Design a protein around this nucleic acid. Sequence first.
RNA 1: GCUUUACUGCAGGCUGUCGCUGAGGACUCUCACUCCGGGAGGAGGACACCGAUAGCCGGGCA
RNA 2: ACUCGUACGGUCACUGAAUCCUGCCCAGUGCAGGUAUCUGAACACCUCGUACAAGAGGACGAAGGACCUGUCAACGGCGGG
RNA 3: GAAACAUCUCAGUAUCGGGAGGAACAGAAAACGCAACGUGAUGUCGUUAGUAACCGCGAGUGAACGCGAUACAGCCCAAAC
Lengths: 92, 194, 145
Amino acid sequence: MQMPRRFNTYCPHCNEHQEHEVEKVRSGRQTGMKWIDRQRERNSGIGNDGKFSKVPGGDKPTKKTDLKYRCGECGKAHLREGWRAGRLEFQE
Amino acid sequence: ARSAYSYIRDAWKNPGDGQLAELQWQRQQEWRNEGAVERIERPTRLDKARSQGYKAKQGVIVARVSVRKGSARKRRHKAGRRSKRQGVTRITRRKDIQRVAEERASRTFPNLRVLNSYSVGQDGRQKWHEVILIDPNHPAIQNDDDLSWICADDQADRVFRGLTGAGRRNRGLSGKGKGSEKTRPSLRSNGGKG
Amino acid sequence: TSKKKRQRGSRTHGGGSHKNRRGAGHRGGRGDAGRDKHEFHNHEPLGKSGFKRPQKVQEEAATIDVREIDENVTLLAADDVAEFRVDVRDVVEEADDADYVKVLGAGQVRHELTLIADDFSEGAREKVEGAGGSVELTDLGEERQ
RNA sequence: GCUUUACUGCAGGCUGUCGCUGAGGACUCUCACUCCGGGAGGAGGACACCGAUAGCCGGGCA
RNA sequence: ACUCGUACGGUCACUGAAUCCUGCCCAGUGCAGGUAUCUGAACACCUCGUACAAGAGGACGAAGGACCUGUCAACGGCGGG
RNA sequence: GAAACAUCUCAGUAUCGGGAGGAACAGAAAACGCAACGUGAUGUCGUUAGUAACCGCGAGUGAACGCGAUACAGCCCAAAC
Ligand SMILES: C=C1C[C@](OC)([C@H](O)C(=O)N[C@@H]2OCO[C@H]3[C@@H]2O[C@H](C[C@H](O)CO)C(C)(C)[C@@H]3OC)O[C@H](C)[C@@H]1C
Ligand SMILES: [Cl-]
Ligand SMILES: [Cl-]
Ligand SMILES: [Cl-]
Ligand SMILES: [Cl-]
Ligand SMILES: [K+]
Ligand SMILES: [Mg+2]
Ligand SMILES: [Mg+2]
Ligand SMILES: [Mg+2]
Ligand SMILES: [Mg+2]
Ligand SMILES: [Mg+2]
Ligand SMILES: [Mg+2]
Ligand SMILES: [Mg+2]
Ligand SMILES: [Mg+2]
Ligand SMILES: [Mg+2]
Ligand code: NA
Ligand code: NA
Ligand code: NA
Ligand code: NA
Ligand code: NA
Ligand code: NA
Ligand code: NA
Ligand code: NA
Ligand code: NA
Ligand code: NA
Ligand code: NA
Ligand SMILES: [Sr+2]
Ligand SMILES: [Sr+2]
Ligand SMILES: [Sr+2]
Ligand SMILES: [Sr+2]
Ligand SMILES: [Sr+2]
Ligand SMILES: [Sr+2]
Ligand SMILES: [Sr+2]
Ligand SMILES: [Sr+2]
Ligand SMILES: [Sr+2]
Ligand SMILES: [Sr+2]
């Protein structure tokens, strides 16, 4: 399955119908000013840490398509679920 | 106006600038060749001394102590002592150097009692402190209205029980309010969590 | 004759196989052990939820239902008998140290009452005025805006 | 108890950096500091030593 | 400690008198050496950020690694067609 | 103990080194912060409370201000001159 760059769909807002884009979450970096950047040095020292002395985990034989449905006139977006797709093409 | 004293003091506010800078660079050379506990006729920092309780009387002794520098000198572990328990070159002790000093001093003088102590410099590998001790047996002091308190049998070895000012400042007793719930009235009285 | 009392002779004292009542294994682990594995049944799921506001930033109001007042108008002979008029503040227990007193409306109001409190519920009023009565907002309550 | 390219750490070695530490991205110096000399004095020199920290290695050890 | 010791020394390993000999292999691993280039932490440093701080990016860049060479009386190898 | 186990727990427990007294320690606010026109050294007891807070946010860990009580007692230097 591909994905129409601009399809006519609904949205939990204006109680109407407009045009919603398709953009795969470009996410964000690590603040450095979060509740995990502090307890990472407080839950350590000499020895082990458990969750901090642990490492990243594997993945499924596929990755669900994480998105963000931006709006035309509006300009904002919401979040739906994703599908296990090896790839995806936002046709045009 | 300013007291001659306030000059000595105002100087040690930055023992690395001006005349005092030249002094230390010199003295230390002599110091580095002295024992670990040297008695000295007069306090190097007069203001501080007097301020801390010093007096030019009979039975009031002053001694410069020199303790090795660094943090902690901890062995690894004999039996099977895990990771969180392998202290050697990454941890330090619960007693600050000045306290170590005061103690070595009072030991050198098995009859004198610690009054207080102050810093007098430190090169790259040792720190020096002058400690004011007092003879609780010289009437010269038994009479003194300002020092006769240090004679009570319950002042014996007062330093070894952390009754020094620096002793108390280390036992976490400075603050009377927040953050001193586990310290006062006694560290031991608080299952040592301070 | 208690249960324990009759156990002498049972050998197992109710346990069953003399092999049961041994160590913590029998209990599935000490305390809340495996609270999410074998003994996961009926254990508030794992996680952190919501937040709390600093303890000294919390308003704890002393409340009372019009019903409580009404039911004791006549029995409150030590109070005002206007054309009845009562300052709730002098009626609620635990008042002295409450962030403020609020009168909650709930139940009938078989009386004409002149109630005075820090704050009332939009309903406590209806039930008051509708009973041919007035309600007065204390000077304190005068922060409703 | 033992092994290793098991997991996790520690000694320890190597290295950058900060303090000790001074005068005029390559240099001179002498005054701290180190070593040799009985001594005079000689060698070395802001390096090395030591405190702290950072990266690599790290069954020698837990 | 070695050490009242100094390379004809003593340390660390292997083989195991004499005698005849001791082939080939440096790809992996180890050790050692070199290295244009690449990679490479922290401090100081530049830009932005915060009346400060948390923070964002840059810049330089050690050992080490990549990479290259030496080495099997170093761990070991000496097949199939 | 966490039904393994590294953080965590056991526990600042066991054990060790130093030292005082008939009691020790603490103690006259760079306090508190029922934020107030409020309290007024210090221990301790009851409570506050398994509360706030911590924590492979797991197992578990865990105060304080206040309040009611016990007893109450406040002072001396350094410096200025
Ligand atoms: C999908 C999975 C992810 C995860 O959640 C279950 C968890 O998120 C994770 O382990 N790694 C994530 O890395 C990406 O985002 C975070 C996450 O946490 C990291 C720290 C880590 O949790 C403890 O060391 C991190 C470094 C904070 C990181 O920052 C980007 O656990 C399994 C790995 C599971 C398979
Ligand atoms: Cl995606
Ligand atoms: Cl003493
Ligand atoms: Cl809340
Ligand atoms: Cl109060
Ligand atoms: K353990
Ligand atoms: Mg995880
Ligand atoms: Mg020598
Ligand atoms: Mg092992
Ligand atoms: Mg043999
Ligand atoms: Mg267990
Ligand atoms: Mg006590
Ligand atoms: Mg578990
Ligand atoms: Mg604890
Ligand atoms: Mg408090
Ligand atoms: Na902390
Ligand atoms: Na003594
Ligand atoms: Na503490
Ligand atoms: Na049984
Ligand atoms: Na109250
Ligand atoms: Na065995
Ligand atoms: Na090879
Ligand atoms: Na062979
Ligand atoms: Na178990
Ligand atoms: Na085990
Ligand atoms: Na923990
Ligand atoms: Sr912490
Ligand atoms: Sr660590
Ligand atoms: Sr799979
Ligand atoms: Sr004694
Ligand atoms: Sr039973
Ligand atoms: Sr048993
Ligand atoms: Sr589960
Ligand atoms: Sr009450
Ligand atoms: Sr090779
Ligand atoms: Sr009092």
